[PDB]
Amino acid sequence: MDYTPHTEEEIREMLRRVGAASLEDLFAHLPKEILSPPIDLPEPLPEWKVLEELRRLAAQNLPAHKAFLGGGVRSHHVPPVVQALAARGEFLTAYTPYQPEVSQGVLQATFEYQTMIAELAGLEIANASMYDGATALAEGVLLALRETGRMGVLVSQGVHPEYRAVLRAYLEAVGAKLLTLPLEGGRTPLPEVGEEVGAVVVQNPNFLGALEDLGPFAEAAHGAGALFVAVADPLSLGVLKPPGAYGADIAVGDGQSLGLPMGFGGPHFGFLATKKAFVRQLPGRLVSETVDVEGRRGFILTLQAREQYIRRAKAKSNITTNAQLTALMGAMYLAALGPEGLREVALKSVEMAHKLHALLLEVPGVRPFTPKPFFNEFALALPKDPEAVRRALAERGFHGATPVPREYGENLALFAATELHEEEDLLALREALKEVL
């Protein structure tokens, strides 16, 4: 089936009007050899049948709702009010707002997104969004290196391994060098920063869930004329002192925790907050307040010399399509909750995580790893292989024990809890874990 409106009579008329003999004739000027390719695709299906197939595939999976898996993504409540609003056709089907007069909706909404992100991180400005947390970190670091003119980067091993991997790719691509600061006792020790270092990177809470002490890292970075880059979970900023208050110059993170569906890893969005004084190095789209010819308030994309259309080769980034819709979902979430509501959600997930930690400590052979204080995620040492444990757990109907790569230690597994978890879910998980062990 299809979405084409054309009737046969209309195609004949249009065909004659453009001097074409048939649909096939429209491609007659292409090299004879590349035509009639042997493409093998399954036969077209009506929409109800496509849905039947989707549902069959979905029926093969075990839903992760109320899962205890962590490592960057967690099962947080996805408010229907937010999803209902982001489903509005105007937001869903609009393109990048290049004609501002008819795009004040998306423009103003993005300006509000920027304000909320900047506030959440304790910083001054923020772009319209990035693909995700990892790429946001890579761009944030590239910014610091362009701003300082240096090529050296120090990254705590506490930064999610995938983030560090993405960072390395972007870094080595432009000739920059990265040095990884390993964790000691779950936390990252204060390093000595040389003058070849343009950026110091630390995540809080870190990969293993440990709260890190950012202050001294910022002072250590500045002392050497290096910029401090903070990787932080946005939901956590609802209760933890933000990097901005620690002296951080750049803050990045993934927006999944702001009520976004897990979606097996995407899409979500990344945020990049910084000082207004670094606006010239800021990559991506930026909305500014302004006024129209009649004196009315308006919003528009600004300082576009930082982007690809105008600067092309010298653009601060090649990023064109960003992650606007999901960033708006985050903004709606932040707005729906307010400062106190956000703090409530964050504290609740932290509370349940701690209760779970306390419960899991009673399981035979289980030993703690992540040190206190930790946030809403923590790693434990298991008496069996973490992948084997996650699998056995799934066989009993539970989603937990997310395997921590060995670079952190042996048999490590992460566990998370959120505002939608209750006492009974924690006990049920522990019993399941005791059975598998």
């Binding site: 056709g89 004609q99 995700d132 993405v166 010819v293 009315r296 399509t321 400062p339």
Partner: protein, 473 residues
């Protein structure tokens, strides 16, 4: 006039209440780690929240409300079916046991198979988050290819046509490559002579869209491929204009080594006011080992995420890709099938050519007009600037096509109607374009007049940028 969400706030007002018994912060985290000053987030009730965003959506237009003939964007209908399809896989965790995510992995694998079948590639990654991300991925792959052959120090430049999109040359820089721009011939296609002059042991790759950004198909593409092959230059395919040839021709059969596609363009994934998207990257077998990890493979037990790839460029983003968007695209293909996609490309081309005919009849010009494909580039008659006509169109309830791009045509009007727009819609659009020429210069220069806002002070926004409600710094 419309208030900011921040102006709607009222001190202490609550919206969502997701916690029954809120714990005391000091019982959970140490004092010195606690935020002292709350972020200045809005404080509104749910009704206010709904009215705000619903009010904003009503001050916005999209494909759902207006004809969007934006060249290089493929603003085609985004079927509502796909939104329902996506909500079906909302509750999946990327780190959950693979044996419990077979439905999802299977979908990822199948999509990759369909995209390779339509593109002629041998391997594929669905990880990159957008077209430009796919470009960075493909170029880094090409770079890893040369380096693995001891030419990583000589292969230093990337070639792009003067009609290339800004992201092409921008990507070269992100990949640490130098970039040289080759001029187009008198027909708007690639200038072979200028190309043969640039090709050499120093060129890492040639980035091209086919059809090109003028909406023209590169008739000497096979020749261009041959020249690249002998010089050892990798031929990169920007899939922005894939909609023009879906199911009729494959870049792989044209000689392209690497390919990237835009699901949020060609495959109906919604534009969402800027994003998010998906930029899959397909490659020929000799570039396959350098693909970013992980790849979805079909094994014995079932499907799995393959990380065992020693020559991999690494990771371009977190997790495995924007899965929910992959669902949209899978749905589209399984719905249209091969015949459906071919018909879509043919009509996408017919709408573009037919509309090209209507605008020329109205007095508009097309400097480069061989058989126009999915889009075309017109210019208004001498004396009219595209900017003003665009604003005039806004006043008339239409949305202008893309303007001032490609960069090689003054007052460029890049028009891409896509296959989902009706005949009568193209005609109404052409009529509006013809009428604007019969409007006085002053009227055009002061348009729009009825839109929620009129022309904005672009100057003030660049000299005194107010980037947040609090304008800190």
């Amino acid at each position: 006039s419309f208030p900011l969400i921040f102006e709607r706030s009222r001190k202490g007002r609550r919206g969502l209440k997701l916690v029954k018994a809120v714990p005391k912060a000091e019982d959970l985290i140490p004092k010195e780690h606690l935020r002292e000053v709350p972020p200045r987030l809005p404080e509104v009730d749910e009704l206010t929240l709904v009215r705000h965003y619903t009010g904003l959506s009503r001050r916005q237009v999209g494909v759902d409300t207006t004809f969007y003939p934006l060249g290089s964007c493929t603003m085609k209908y985004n079927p509502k079916l796909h939104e329902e399809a996506a909500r079906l896989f909302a509750d999946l965790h990327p780190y959950q046991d693979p044996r419990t995510a077979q439905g999802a992995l299977r979908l990822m694998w199948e999509l990759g198979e369909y995209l390779k079948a339509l593109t002629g590639m041998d391997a594929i990654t669905l990880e990159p988050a957008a077209g430009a991300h796919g470009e960075l991925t493909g170029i880094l792959i090409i770079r890893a290819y040369h380096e693995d052959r001891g030419e990583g120090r000589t292969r230093r430049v990337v070639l792009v046509p003067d009609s290339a999109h800004g992201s092409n040359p921008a990507t070269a820089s992100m990949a640490g490559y130098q970039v040289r721009e080759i001029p187009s011939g008198p027909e708007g296609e690639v200038d072979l002579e200028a190309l043969k002059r640039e090709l050499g042991p120093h060129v890492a790759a040639l980035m091209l869209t086919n059809p090109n950004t003028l909406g023209l198909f590169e008739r000497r593409i096979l020749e261009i491929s041959r020249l690249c092959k002998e010089a050892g230059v990798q031929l990169y395919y920007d899939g922005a204009n894939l909609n023009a040839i879906m199911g009729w021709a494959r870049p792989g059969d044209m000689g392209f080594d690497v390919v990237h596609l835009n699901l949020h363009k060609t495959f109906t994934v919604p534009h969402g006011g800027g994003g998010p998207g998906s930029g899959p990257v397909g490659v020929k077998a000799h570039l396959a080992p350098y693909l970013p990890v992980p790849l979805v493979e079909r094994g014995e037990e079932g499907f799995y995420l393959d990380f065992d790839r020693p020559k991999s460029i690494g990771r371009v983003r977190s997790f495995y890709g924007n899965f929910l968007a992959l669902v949209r695209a899978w749905a589209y293909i399984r719905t249209l099938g091969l015949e459906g996609l071919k018909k879509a490309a043919a009509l996408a081309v017919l709408n573009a050519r037919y509309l090209k005919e209507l605008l020329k009849e109205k007095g508009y010009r097309v400097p480069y007009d061989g058989p126009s494909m999915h889009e075309f580039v017109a210019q208004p008659p001498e004396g009219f600037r595209a900017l003003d006509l665009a604003k005039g169109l806004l006043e008339l309830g239409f949305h202008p096509p893309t303007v001032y791009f490609p960069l090689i045509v003054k007052e460029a009007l890049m028009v891409e109607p896509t296959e989902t727009e009706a005949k009568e819609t193209l005609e109404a659009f052409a009529e509006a374009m013809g009428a604007l020429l019969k409007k006085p210069k002053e009227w055009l220069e002061n348009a729009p007049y009825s839109t929620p806002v009129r022309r904005l002070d672009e100057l003030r926004a660049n000299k005194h940028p107010k980037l947040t409600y609090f304008d800190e710094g």
